[PDB]
Ligand code: HEM
Ligand code: HEM
């Protein structure tokens with residue numbers, strides 16, 4: 001993880017702007033549609049299109065990612081409670097983290113076509129993989 | 140990792156003793172026999188049974204693992220040159236690190252039946268996964 | 279694709295495998311080493327500690343059934359796809375198990391075999407058994423393919 | 424297995440795909456984001472920087488060939504296993520490429536399609552294309568099965 005990657009990630013996530021919750025909800029919808037095996041972690045959720053529960057969950061995930069961007073240098077300490085939750089309480093398979101990272105990348109590519117240069121793509125992929133690694137570190 | 144994992148890994152690697160080179164050579168032989176796709180990274184090697192080149196390389200790998208055991212709390216810095224080598228020069232696929240970790244676990248199981256309790260198996264798996272994720276950190 | 283010598287070695291080693299503890303041991307070690315797999319076995323009782331996992335009658339009985347399927351697949355090495363069709367559907371659609379956990383379970387089984395056999399589990403024997411477990415996992419993941 | 428509506432959406436989106444550029448940028452982005460894949464493309468020249476990768480004529484031509492293979496797979500969505508038999512032999516027996524890199528390249532292609540189509544790419548369109556790329560990767564990885 002390099003400082004150039006950190007700068008590129010901060011720039012891309014800043015140009016994401018206040019649409020972070022919308023991006024998170026769309027990424028979750030994409031993950032549910034593309035990989036239905038991930039829907040089993042949300043049995044109490046309304047997983048239809050436009051669902052308010054999915055909107056709130058996407059807002060929460062996007063806020064977590066904003067905190068991670070704000071604390072790229074201290075990710076394990078910033079995401080400690082989330083790693084504990086996702087590894088102990090939920091016991092999420094580590095492959096679904098890759099699936100959600102891919103869907104987040106697809107949402108970013110579809111909503112920021114100009115910013116999604118190959119270098120920014122690589123930087124964002126490294127950032128999301130590090131957040132996934134941190135969240136799966138309790139295994 | 141965990142303090143109990145560190146204790147279990149240290150005890151198991153101590154019971155390995157001075158057979159580290161033998162165990163590393165056997166693990167590399169197991170990897171070459173089970174996953175022939177890994178043999179493409181050693182095109183200048185004699186990879187027959189009992190080959191002195193494989194013996195020396197296995198001794199080097201086992202010495203690196205022993206250093207990692209002795210420096211379990213500072214693996215990323217103790218393995219930085221190895222990470223640079225494997226990621227930049229060698230360009231090894233990350234999947235092969237899992238393959239070699241599995242073959243190392245199989246060698247340890249086959250040579251230390253009493254030591255290989257489920258807790259020790261879990262501790263050694265976590266230790267090898269940490270070593271692998273350090274050696275694939277640059278990616 | 280197993281050579282006749284590999285098949286002979288595989289069946290010779292499997293002849294000495296105890297079918298009452300090897301499967302339960304492999305399943306319990308899978309649960310201990312990959313604790314996200316405990317998500318699929320919430321009805322199996324206490325699985326908080328390695329000793330509680332390894333002392334679970336439900337885990338032992340289920341490991342016996344998984345070992346029996348592994349022996350059933352081993353008896354038909356040329357028809358793994360047809361041997362594991364019903365099992366593949368139950369994991370893919372009803373249980374939603376990622377096909378990587380199949381390879382994880384096969385690798386844990388190989389570790390258990392090495393732990394029991396020791397010197398008898400030579401690198402050629404291990405290579406043949408890796409072929410066997412890879413074939414079994416590929417057959418079990420057919421519904422995803 | 425794709426429904427008629429999914430197939431219609433997939434074909435409609437593929438109708439407006441630039442066959443001279445898209446495969447090249449997909450291959451280049453694969454080389455940049457997963458730089459261990461550069462070990463298979465040593466004879467392609469300079470690959471040190473993203474600009475060097477995305478400005479490489481060899482990468483452009485090879486990506487064009489890969490995109491043509493993807494298009495042929497799209498034209499035989501029900502015969503993917505038979506369409507990619509020769510390519511599966513080429514990639515497994517001689518190249519030694521790991522089947523996970525096929526998934527990586529398919530996902531990079533999906534990201535490239537999203538980056539071009541934008542709003543027109545939709546979550547259902549992404550689901551259909553994920554099905555397509557998973558099928559292509561499975562067909563190309565069959566020789567490991
Ligand atoms: C970058 C990856 C991820 C991030 C940043 C993230 C973030 C979050 C956050 C902030 C919460 C809220 C926790 C709370 O309110 O107590 C949460 C909950 C949750 N996450 Fe994730 N998550 C990620 C990946 C995943 C994946 C891939 C899955 C499943 C496939 C998953 C499953 C869940 C579940 C089931 C909950 C519980 C929400 C509820 O029950 O209300 N997470 N996550
Ligand atoms: C368990 C994790 C591993 C450890 C601790 C490890 C350790 C080492 C060490 C100590 C060296 C020698 C360093 C030197 O003198 O330059 C080395 C070299 C090398 N390793 Fe690894 N290695 C690991 C995994 C792998 C894997 C999975 C592969 C790929 C199959 C691999 C391929 C190589 C190659 C090709 C060399 C250079 C060999 C030569 O040209 O002589 N290593 N490794």
Ligand code: HEM
Nearest residue numbers: 315318319343344347348365373375379380381383384418
């Ligand atoms: C890799 C080789 C595997 C084999 C040969 C195998 C075999 C079997 C067998 C024989 C059953 C009994 C089905 C029945 O009694 O109707 C079963 C059920 C089950 N399997 Fe597996 N299994 C494998 C892997 C896995 C893995 C890796 C997991 C989870 C991570 C898993 C989760 C389950 C569960 C939860 C059941 C309960 C279904 C029921 O009780 O009806 N299996 N499997």
Ligand code: HEM
Nearest residue numbers: 460463464488489492493518520524525526528529560563
């Ligand atoms: C995932 C879908 C893929 C498709 C559809 C595809 C398609 C192709 C095609 C059409 C060729 C040319 C074959 C010929 O000219 O006879 C080729 C060659 C090649 N492929 Fe792929 N490829 C894929 C993935 C990959 C990946 C992920 C890698 C490496 C990480 C790779 C490495 C290579 C190399 C090095 C060649 C050169 C061999 C030659 O030119 O004969 N391929 N591929």
